[PDB]
Amino acid sequence: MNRGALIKLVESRYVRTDLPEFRPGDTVRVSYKVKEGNRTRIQDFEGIVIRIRRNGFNTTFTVRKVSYGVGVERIFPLHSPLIQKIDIVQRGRARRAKLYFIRNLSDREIRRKLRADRKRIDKDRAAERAAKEEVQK
Amino acid sequence: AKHPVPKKKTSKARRDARRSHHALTPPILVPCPECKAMKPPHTVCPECGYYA
Amino acid sequence: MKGILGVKVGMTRIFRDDRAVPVTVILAGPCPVVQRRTPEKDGYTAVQLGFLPQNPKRVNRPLKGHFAKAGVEPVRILREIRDFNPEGDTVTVEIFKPGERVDVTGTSKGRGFAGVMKRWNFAGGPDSHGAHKIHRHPGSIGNRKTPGRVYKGKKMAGHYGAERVTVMNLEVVDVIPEENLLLVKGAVPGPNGGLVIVRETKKA
Amino acid sequence: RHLKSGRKLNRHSSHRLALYRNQAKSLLTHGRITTTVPKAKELRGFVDHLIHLAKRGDLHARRLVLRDLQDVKLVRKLFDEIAPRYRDRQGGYTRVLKLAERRRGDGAPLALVELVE
Amino acid sequence: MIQPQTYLEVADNTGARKIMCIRVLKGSNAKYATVGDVIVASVKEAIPRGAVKEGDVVKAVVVRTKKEVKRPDGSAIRFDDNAAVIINNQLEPRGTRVFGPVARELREKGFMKIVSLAPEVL
RNA sequence: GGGGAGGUUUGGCACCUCGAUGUCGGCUCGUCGCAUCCUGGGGCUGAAGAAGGUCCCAAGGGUUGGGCUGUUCGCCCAUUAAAGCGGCACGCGAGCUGGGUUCAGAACGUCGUGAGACAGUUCGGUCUCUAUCCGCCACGGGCGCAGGAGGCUUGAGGGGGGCUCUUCCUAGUACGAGAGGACCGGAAGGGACGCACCUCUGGUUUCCCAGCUGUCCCUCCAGGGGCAUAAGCUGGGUAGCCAUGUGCGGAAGGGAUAACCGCUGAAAGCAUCUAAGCGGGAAGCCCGCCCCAAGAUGAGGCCUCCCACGGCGUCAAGCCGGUAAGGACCCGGGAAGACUACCCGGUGGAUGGGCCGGGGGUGUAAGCGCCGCGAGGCGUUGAGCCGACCGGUCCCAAUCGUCCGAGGUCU
RNA sequence: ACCGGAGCGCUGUCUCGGCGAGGGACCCGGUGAAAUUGAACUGGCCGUGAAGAUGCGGCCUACCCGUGGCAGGACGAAAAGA
RNA sequence: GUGCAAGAGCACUCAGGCGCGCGGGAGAACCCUCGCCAAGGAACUCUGCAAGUUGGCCCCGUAACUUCGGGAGAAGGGGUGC
RNA sequence: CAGUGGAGGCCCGAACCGGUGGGGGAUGCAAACCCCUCGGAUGAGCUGGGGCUAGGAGUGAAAAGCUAACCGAGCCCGGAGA
RNA sequence: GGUGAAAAGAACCCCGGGAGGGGAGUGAAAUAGAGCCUGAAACCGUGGGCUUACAAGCAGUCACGGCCCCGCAAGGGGUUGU
Ligand SMILES: [Mg+2]
Ligand SMILES: [Mg+2]
Ligand SMILES: [Mg+2]
Ligand SMILES: [Mg+2]
Ligand SMILES: [Mg+2]
Ligand SMILES: [Mg+2]
Ligand SMILES: [Mg+2]
Ligand SMILES: [Mg+2]
Ligand SMILES: [Mg+2]
Ligand SMILES: [Mg+2]
Ligand SMILES: [Mg+2]
Ligand SMILES: [Mg+2]
Ligand SMILES: [Mg+2]
Ligand SMILES: [Mg+2]
Ligand SMILES: [Mg+2]
Ligand SMILES: [Mg+2]
Ligand SMILES: [Mg+2]
Ligand SMILES: [Mg+2]
Ligand SMILES: [Mg+2]
Ligand SMILES: [Mg+2]
Ligand SMILES: [Mg+2]
Ligand SMILES: [Mg+2]
Ligand SMILES: [Mg+2]
Ligand SMILES: [Mg+2]
Ligand SMILES: [Mg+2]
Ligand SMILES: [Mg+2]
Ligand SMILES: [Mg+2]
Ligand SMILES: [Mg+2]
Ligand SMILES: [Mg+2]
Ligand SMILES: [Mg+2]
Ligand SMILES: [Mg+2]
Ligand SMILES: [Mg+2]
Ligand SMILES: [Mg+2]
Ligand SMILES: [Mg+2]
Ligand SMILES: [Mg+2]
Ligand SMILES: [Mg+2]
Ligand SMILES: [Mg+2]
Ligand SMILES: [Mg+2]
Ligand SMILES: [Mg+2]
Ligand SMILES: [Mg+2]
Ligand SMILES: [Mg+2]
Ligand SMILES: [Mg+2]
Ligand SMILES: [Mg+2]
Ligand SMILES: [Mg+2]
Ligand SMILES: [Mg+2]
Ligand SMILES: [Mg+2]
Ligand SMILES: [Mg+2]
Ligand SMILES: [Mg+2]
Ligand SMILES: [Mg+2]
Ligand SMILES: [Mg+2]
Ligand SMILES: [Mg+2]
Ligand SMILES: [Mg+2]
Ligand SMILES: [Mg+2]
Ligand SMILES: [Mg+2]
Ligand SMILES: [Mg+2]
Ligand SMILES: [Mg+2]
Ligand SMILES: [Mg+2]
Ligand SMILES: [Mg+2]
Ligand SMILES: [Mg+2]
Ligand SMILES: [Mg+2]
Ligand SMILES: [Mg+2]
Ligand SMILES: [Mg+2]
Ligand SMILES: [Mg+2]
Ligand SMILES: [Mg+2]
Ligand SMILES: [Mg+2]
Ligand SMILES: [Mg+2]
Ligand SMILES: [Mg+2]
Ligand SMILES: [Mg+2]
Ligand SMILES: [Mg+2]
Ligand SMILES: [Mg+2]
Ligand SMILES: [Mg+2]
Ligand SMILES: [Mg+2]
Ligand SMILES: [Mg+2]
Ligand SMILES: [Mg+2]
Ligand SMILES: [Mg+2]
Ligand SMILES: [Mg+2]
Ligand SMILES: [Mg+2]
Ligand SMILES: [Mg+2]
Ligand SMILES: [Mg+2]
Ligand SMILES: [Mg+2]
Ligand SMILES: [Mg+2]
Ligand SMILES: [Mg+2]
Ligand SMILES: [Mg+2]
Ligand SMILES: [Mg+2]
Ligand SMILES: [Mg+2]
Ligand SMILES: [Mg+2]
Ligand SMILES: [Mg+2]
Ligand SMILES: [Mg+2]
Ligand SMILES: [Mg+2]
Ligand SMILES: [Mg+2]
Ligand SMILES: [Mg+2]
Ligand SMILES: [Mg+2]
Ligand SMILES: [Mg+2]
Ligand SMILES: [Mg+2]
Ligand SMILES: [Mg+2]
Ligand SMILES: [Mg+2]
Ligand SMILES: [Mg+2]
Ligand SMILES: [Mg+2]
Ligand SMILES: [Mg+2]
Ligand SMILES: [Mg+2]
Ligand SMILES: [Mg+2]
Ligand SMILES: [Mg+2]
Ligand SMILES: [Mg+2]
Ligand SMILES: [Mg+2]
Ligand SMILES: [Mg+2]
Ligand SMILES: [Mg+2]
Ligand SMILES: [Mg+2]
Ligand SMILES: [Mg+2]
Ligand SMILES: [Mg+2]
Ligand SMILES: [Mg+2]
Ligand SMILES: [Mg+2]
Ligand SMILES: [Mg+2]
Ligand SMILES: [Mg+2]
Ligand SMILES: [Mg+2]
Ligand SMILES: [Mg+2]
Ligand SMILES: [Mg+2]
Ligand SMILES: [Mg+2]
Ligand SMILES: [Mg+2]
Ligand SMILES: [Mg+2]
Ligand SMILES: [Mg+2]
Ligand SMILES: [Mg+2]
Ligand SMILES: [Mg+2]
Ligand SMILES: [Mg+2]
Ligand SMILES: [Mg+2]
Ligand SMILES: [Mg+2]
Ligand SMILES: [Mg+2]
Ligand SMILES: [Mg+2]
Ligand SMILES: [Mg+2]
Ligand SMILES: [Mg+2]
Ligand SMILES: [Mg+2]
Ligand SMILES: [Mg+2]
Ligand SMILES: [Mg+2]
Ligand SMILES: [Mg+2]
Ligand SMILES: [Mg+2]
Ligand SMILES: [Mg+2]
Ligand SMILES: [Mg+2]
Ligand SMILES: [Mg+2]
Ligand SMILES: [Mg+2]
Ligand SMILES: [Mg+2]
Ligand SMILES: [Mg+2]
Ligand SMILES: [Mg+2]
Ligand SMILES: [Mg+2]
Ligand SMILES: [Mg+2]
Ligand SMILES: [Mg+2]
Ligand SMILES: [Mg+2]
Ligand SMILES: [Mg+2]
Ligand SMILES: [Mg+2]
Ligand SMILES: [Mg+2]
Ligand SMILES: [Mg+2]
Ligand SMILES: [Mg+2]
Ligand SMILES: [Mg+2]
Ligand SMILES: [Mg+2]
Ligand SMILES: [Mg+2]
Ligand SMILES: [Mg+2]
Ligand SMILES: [Mg+2]
Ligand SMILES: [Mg+2]
Ligand SMILES: [Mg+2]
Ligand SMILES: [Mg+2]
Ligand SMILES: [Mg+2]
Ligand SMILES: [Mg+2]
Ligand SMILES: [Mg+2]
Ligand SMILES: [Mg+2]
Ligand SMILES: [Mg+2]
Ligand SMILES: [Mg+2]
Ligand SMILES: [Mg+2]
Ligand SMILES: [Mg+2]
Ligand SMILES: [Mg+2]
Ligand SMILES: [Mg+2]
Ligand SMILES: [Mg+2]
Ligand SMILES: [Mg+2]
Ligand SMILES: [Mg+2]
Ligand SMILES: [Mg+2]
Ligand SMILES: [Mg+2]
Ligand SMILES: [Mg+2]
Ligand SMILES: [Mg+2]
Ligand SMILES: [Mg+2]
Ligand SMILES: [Mg+2]
Ligand SMILES: [Mg+2]
Ligand SMILES: [Mg+2]
Ligand SMILES: [Mg+2]
Ligand SMILES: [Mg+2]
Ligand SMILES: [Mg+2]
Ligand SMILES: [Mg+2]
Ligand SMILES: [Mg+2]
Ligand SMILES: [Mg+2]
Ligand SMILES: [Mg+2]
Ligand SMILES: [Mg+2]
Ligand SMILES: [Mg+2]
Ligand SMILES: [Mg+2]
Ligand SMILES: [Mg+2]
Ligand SMILES: [Mg+2]
Ligand SMILES: [Mg+2]
Ligand SMILES: [Mg+2]
Ligand SMILES: [Mg+2]
Ligand SMILES: [Mg+2]
Ligand SMILES: [Mg+2]
Ligand SMILES: [Mg+2]
Ligand SMILES: [Mg+2]
Ligand SMILES: [Mg+2]
Ligand SMILES: [Mg+2]
Ligand SMILES: [Mg+2]
Ligand SMILES: [Mg+2]
Ligand SMILES: [Mg+2]
Ligand SMILES: [Mg+2]
Ligand SMILES: [Mg+2]
Ligand SMILES: [Mg+2]
Ligand SMILES: [Mg+2]
Ligand SMILES: [Mg+2]
Ligand SMILES: [Mg+2]
Ligand SMILES: [Mg+2]
Ligand SMILES: [Mg+2]
16 A cells, blocks of 8 residues: 555556657657547647656647647647657757747747757767667668 | 624623633643653653663 | 445546546455344444454454454454445455446545635625725625524535545446556545545436 | 645744754754754754765765855864764754743743754 | 637638627527637628628637647647637638638537638647 | 405605614625516417417526616617516625715806805715624534443434536428428437536646846855845746646436326216326425434444442442543644644654655756857756655654543332 | 726736735733623514514523634614714 | 946945844634736726836837927837846 | 027926825824825925914915814803803 | 821741741730721632523512421521422
8 A cells, every 4th residue: 555656656557658758949740640520540740849747657748830820739648549659850959948938939039049959969860870770780 | 892892791600601611731740760750741851861 | 236445546547549538546455344234133234344454553442352253354444335235255346347337435625714715615805996804705694683693504614624525426437456446537535545435326 | 724735934934044044053063952842843854954965075065055054164063073973874863852841931842952862 | 718808810801800709609608618619709800891891790610719728639739819710690601711720629510611721620 | 347465666654763773876695485587387279380379387496798877777789598576674884885875175057135055967075903692604622321431323303406508310200382390209519506626737836946137245266145025036846725627416216296187986867087086297395316413311223342349338329549441641743623623653663854766846056178269168967956746764753651441320 | 196988008807716925813821901881591483562572472492611703683882863 | 335327216235223122833714915827808897996017228210289389208119138 | 500508386306395096004003194106396395493473363375274183263260050 | 197005016937039928026906017997898719508511581489399507396597499
């Protein structure tokens, strides 16, 4: 009994593992399963991650973007059965945990305020190609 | 004064009755092991002391 | 009519097919039946389930005399489940197949001495145009010379919370016998670690 | 009902913080200190932190502890004497024993605080 | 969540730029309206010689909100503004081409026409 | 033309109150009436159907948001199942407001020689911290419950809840020339309200982290502290408490009935629902659901535990000390709490504090190296710091002890 | 800093309330008032009575004493009605 | 004294003087004073009462009307640190 | 027209003089106070000291305002035991 | 306004920081002990008797009963259960 959490934590097996690490201040592209009419598709969604609300399992993250003149944000359960995959697209300088502030900034300022984390990229592409070697041979 | 005020002098009966729960109770005491005197449990007291 | 004692372990949410579901986890540990109410001896029918392992320390009480006549490991708690007589042994989560619905009972969180606005969810006066000393007050409480008194059970501020609260028709979302666990539809009275009894619903 | 949380106080924040400090200074200056019970039970944990933080040695720790006790000579005594004494120990660097005398003219109960030994 | 006295962006060439909510046509006394909810409203301003004139009392349906819509799949979604599409009394949209995204709740509600002309459902 | 009921209007009378019973409207909180606005059940219809009309039964719940005016009232906008009418000092100012009325200022029209005056108008104009008793909401102390104690309970008697729409299948079927369009039965989705909850969404989170200005100080640099609230400002923020968020409720069903519809059926050879007798029939009644509840002085029931006197009272019941089961004190505490109460723990112990780990928050600390003239930048680095949450560990603190507590009446 | 109408900006004025801070309230120790007060052993309903009853009648209800709260009554207090 | 356009303003601080002659705890309702708040933005109300919004200096720019002075800080913008 | 010049019951704003709106206070810190807000601030300005005018009399940018904490006729003593 | 005939106004010892007491002492009397003759009532307190925690009240009166106390007795006093 003296593990009230670990018990409630046992129900965690609905947990993912495939998904790649990413943190606010860099843009991604989730592929969500959706019910159109009655069937099932795979709608993409690509924008900057503005918030990650950590809480072990059932942690969440929210991405925003501009669709046809209007802004739009979506909240995704991190370990959701509907996220087929989540291709990251570009890393960038955080400097802050929650970046709501870009809401009032959607313009040239964003691009210049969130440069590009050459560090988290230099490790991305490095351990990408450099790690491809070990698996192939 | 302003607005409410007693409608009648309280009787010496009712008065003392109210006070039925005012009485005190003696302090809880125990004979301290070291000395002979009394101490309030869980406390150190003069003319005595403690072990380490 | 089933029955079983447990603790509110906490709650989170799991996914049923392509839909998320909020669930409260209840540990309905194995309950050693302790006595039996019968029409002949007691005047009614029921079963006194025990629950949770007691150290023979606090059992200094002649409770041991009750546990002896049943040959049971001393428990920390025990309440009856009315009109439910299981075979002589022990009840467990096994009686709850998923999709069944249950009536859960628990002692709500204690909101202490609560104002009328929190307790009875009154309206209270204006934050603004005058008054400024009755913002959270209940205002009038009566009439005039007639009836010239206040109604019995009038809504007024006071202690509120930490009372016997029974929710109903909660869905048994799952059941993990390997852990005496029991998943529900989330909203169950009381705080975590709180004792809580789960019964069969009265929908049907 | 507030309090479902966990902490205690009187006075306002900047004062209460100043209180814990000015006590822990005297306490790390006299080794024995007498205050009111509640003030003591609270001071208790505040010191077991600088003391343990004192078991570590790096200048970062020193600089951290300076933020509370302003006196440099005092942090010396803490690092170069008080701390070593508590090597090979893990917590409970401090002790609180309630006295049997109340304060007169306000009837407040007292208790002793001391660097353990 | 839209309620009377609220302003809405008009997402179609009906001529109207902005309309204010008059009444949310859910229950007999509903507090608020949301995506896929219809509302009576006043045209608080419109473009010259539009089908709808400034001052008309129109019906419209919420296509976007600022308060995130919570979906059963555990996700949610919110837009930068509150928007609507003026509709015919038989509930078909009055204007044609509708601009900007839309919540798919519009679909389950029976606004096929509008999700169609929508340049992007989300 | 005629007879009544009611006591919401306007009056009549002048009966309590002029050593004072504060007047309208609004707000808050309601509760009651039924002469019913809606929903439920019926009769008739000039009821094809859908929809109405009229009367009957029925308070159980419901009875929206705005524009104008101090308004009540009323008009209007947009909805609705409906936007019911009255009582309660036209309910409620020791609950609030004070726009209106109803003091002194001032002005208009009007009257008056005048001072002034107006159910005429206009702008302004001090609303009193402390509840004794009854009542009401909560929470304890005492004693009782004819042995004492631990735990579990029965439910007399109360209380809460009680609403309604919409689309779809039945079926474009019965009905109708057409337009339109059912009963009965079944399904889905809502509005408002109520209870509980923090997973999610979304708030607060007063020192959890970070950044920034001015100044003063430590210690010159660097680093850091105070004050700029009772957080100096700002960007974020766990637990807890919360709704905008999540779950669940209104029932089902049983029983007796209202209007009403009937069977059998006389009195009264026919006829009659009725006089004997019986069946059906409401959102209403009684149960059922949830909550309180044996001070139910009619003080209940079950399981279990401890039992003789140890001294005076011969008669009467008691009375005084030591103890049994068991309880209390004191201490560490708590999603329990104003206090008390309630609950857990007290060295055979993880109750609090510290330390450790995890969760979580902030978002690369200090120091050093490197690049730049420099403000800075880069690396070491998801670093450093790090409340409340989930656990672990006897380092510190619950040390030692004290007090009360049956001897069980009689027929 | 006159009085009326409208609009933009902004907002807890409001839908509709929630959380947080501090000073009181609450508990302990010290000091310790006031208006008021015929006397009190001071319940509910329906009547009744000088026409609005804790005190009369009938009936219902109710173990003794307090503490924190609410303001319907005591035709509450105050001021020999302006 | 330092800073801010200036100043006897504001913030911190010299010299100097004080913590206001009841304290201790608790962390209910409720009152006062203060901070914040999803969506909405006057729907509040007799009345935007209240509170918020705006705020300093520099630069661009500024309408009807006018008694030619005004209206003007109109309005609306941009800059501000190292 | 430029320059110089520095006028004003001019402008912003402390001291200072006020008392606009709201809140608190109501046996008050206070027999008129506290907080936020607001008005004037070279003038019909504010202010220290020395003086004069008073009871049907004074003074009054006029409210019957003020004339020692209540002025449609001050206070005290007397007529007076009206 | 008042000790007492007279200060004979309480040496000395004891508890106490003091105040104030307890003894000793003076006096006819100290409950005449110093704002001290007499010392009423309201009001506060200590002890004793009767009485009260299912009870409805202008508080009393009438009756009976119980307990306690006075007198050998018939009797009387206090209290109060119905
Ligand atoms: Mg665990
Ligand atoms: Mg737990
Ligand atoms: Mg409010
Ligand atoms: Mg007022
Ligand atoms: Mg007031
Ligand atoms: Mg009455
Ligand atoms: Mg009454
Ligand atoms: Mg937990
Ligand atoms: Mg805690
Ligand atoms: Mg501060
Ligand atoms: Mg710590
Ligand atoms: Mg007649
Ligand atoms: Mg009448
Ligand atoms: Mg009349
Ligand atoms: Mg009369
Ligand atoms: Mg007459
Ligand atoms: Mg009177
Ligand atoms: Mg009166
Ligand atoms: Mg009135
Ligand atoms: Mg009124
Ligand atoms: Mg009908
Ligand atoms: Mg029909
Ligand atoms: Mg027809
Ligand atoms: Mg016809
Ligand atoms: Mg027809
Ligand atoms: Mg039909
Ligand atoms: Mg009839
Ligand atoms: Mg009727
Ligand atoms: Mg209306
Ligand atoms: Mg209409
Ligand atoms: Mg309708
Ligand atoms: Mg209609
Ligand atoms: Mg209607
Ligand atoms: Mg009527
Ligand atoms: Mg009414
Ligand atoms: Mg009235
Ligand atoms: Mg009337
Ligand atoms: Mg009235
Ligand atoms: Mg009032
Ligand atoms: Mg009123
Ligand atoms: Mg009053
Ligand atoms: Mg006013
Ligand atoms: Mg009004
Ligand atoms: Mg007016
Ligand atoms: Mg008037
Ligand atoms: Mg008058
Ligand atoms: Mg006048
Ligand atoms: Mg008139
Ligand atoms: Mg007026
Ligand atoms: Mg007041
Ligand atoms: Mg009374
Ligand atoms: Mg009463
Ligand atoms: Mg019952
Ligand atoms: Mg009932
Ligand atoms: Mg009922
Ligand atoms: Mg009801
Ligand atoms: Mg059909
Ligand atoms: Mg069809
Ligand atoms: Mg079909
Ligand atoms: Mg046919
Ligand atoms: Mg026809
Ligand atoms: Mg036909
Ligand atoms: Mg045909
Ligand atoms: Mg046909
Ligand atoms: Mg034909
Ligand atoms: Mg047809
Ligand atoms: Mg058709
Ligand atoms: Mg929850
Ligand atoms: Mg939080
Ligand atoms: Mg800190
Ligand atoms: Mg944090
Ligand atoms: Mg430096
Ligand atoms: Mg600094
Ligand atoms: Mg300060
Ligand atoms: Mg500020
Ligand atoms: Mg500030
Ligand atoms: Mg700071
Ligand atoms: Mg902050
Ligand atoms: Mg039924
Ligand atoms: Mg049944
Ligand atoms: Mg009937
Ligand atoms: Mg027949
Ligand atoms: Mg019959
Ligand atoms: Mg019959
Ligand atoms: Mg039947
Ligand atoms: Mg029924
Ligand atoms: Mg129903
Ligand atoms: Mg029955
Ligand atoms: Mg029955
Ligand atoms: Mg209970
Ligand atoms: Mg119960
Ligand atoms: Mg009992
Ligand atoms: Mg019971
Ligand atoms: Mg019993
Ligand atoms: Mg038994
Ligand atoms: Mg024996
Ligand atoms: Mg024997
Ligand atoms: Mg112990
Ligand atoms: Mg052990
Ligand atoms: Mg521990
Ligand atoms: Mg621990
Ligand atoms: Mg950690
Ligand atoms: Mg983390
Ligand atoms: Mg770095
Ligand atoms: Mg290097
Ligand atoms: Mg270099
Ligand atoms: Mg260099
Ligand atoms: Mg790592
Ligand atoms: Mg903290
Ligand atoms: Mg560990
Ligand atoms: Mg004993
Ligand atoms: Mg004994
Ligand atoms: Mg006995
Ligand atoms: Mg003016
Ligand atoms: Mg506006
Ligand atoms: Mg804001
Ligand atoms: Mg309101
Ligand atoms: Mg507080
Ligand atoms: Mg006070
Ligand atoms: Mg104070
Ligand atoms: Mg006190
Ligand atoms: Mg009573
Ligand atoms: Mg009657
Ligand atoms: Mg009478
Ligand atoms: Mg009489
Ligand atoms: Mg009376
Ligand atoms: Mg009589
Ligand atoms: Mg009576
Ligand atoms: Mg009663
Ligand atoms: Mg008290
Ligand atoms: Mg109170
Ligand atoms: Mg009252
Ligand atoms: Mg009050
Ligand atoms: Mg009254
Ligand atoms: Mg008079
Ligand atoms: Mg500056
Ligand atoms: Mg400046
Ligand atoms: Mg500058
Ligand atoms: Mg001085
Ligand atoms: Mg003071
Ligand atoms: Mg002092
Ligand atoms: Mg702030
Ligand atoms: Mg703000
Ligand atoms: Mg807001
Ligand atoms: Mg905001
Ligand atoms: Mg916002
Ligand atoms: Mg706006
Ligand atoms: Mg308005
Ligand atoms: Mg309104
Ligand atoms: Mg209004
Ligand atoms: Mg108006
Ligand atoms: Mg304002
Ligand atoms: Mg405000
Ligand atoms: Mg503010
Ligand atoms: Mg601002
Ligand atoms: Mg600016
Ligand atoms: Mg600003
Ligand atoms: Mg001019
Ligand atoms: Mg400007
Ligand atoms: Mg202008
Ligand atoms: Mg401007
Ligand atoms: Mg600007
Ligand atoms: Mg800088
Ligand atoms: Mg020129
Ligand atoms: Mg020049
Ligand atoms: Mg000049
Ligand atoms: Mg010049
Ligand atoms: Mg001037
Ligand atoms: Mg001016
Ligand atoms: Mg002046
Ligand atoms: Mg003013
Ligand atoms: Mg003022
Ligand atoms: Mg004014
Ligand atoms: Mg006021
Ligand atoms: Mg005022
Ligand atoms: Mg006041
Ligand atoms: Mg005061
Ligand atoms: Mg202002
Ligand atoms: Mg000024
Ligand atoms: Mg000025
Ligand atoms: Mg002068
Ligand atoms: Mg002079
Ligand atoms: Mg002179
Ligand atoms: Mg005169
Ligand atoms: Mg003058
Ligand atoms: Mg005088
Ligand atoms: Mg005169
Ligand atoms: Mg005289
Ligand atoms: Mg006379
Ligand atoms: Mg004469
Ligand atoms: Mg003498
Ligand atoms: Mg002596
Ligand atoms: Mg001395
Ligand atoms: Mg002496
Ligand atoms: Mg003597
Ligand atoms: Mg003698
Ligand atoms: Mg004699
Ligand atoms: Mg003598
Ligand atoms: Mg004598
Ligand atoms: Mg004498
Ligand atoms: Mg004397
Ligand atoms: Mg005397
Ligand atoms: Mg004599
Ligand atoms: Mg006497
Ligand atoms: Mg006595
Ligand atoms: Mg007795
Ligand atoms: Mg009695
Ligand atoms: Mg009676
Ligand atoms: Mg005796
Ligand atoms: Mg005798
Ligand atoms: Mg008697």
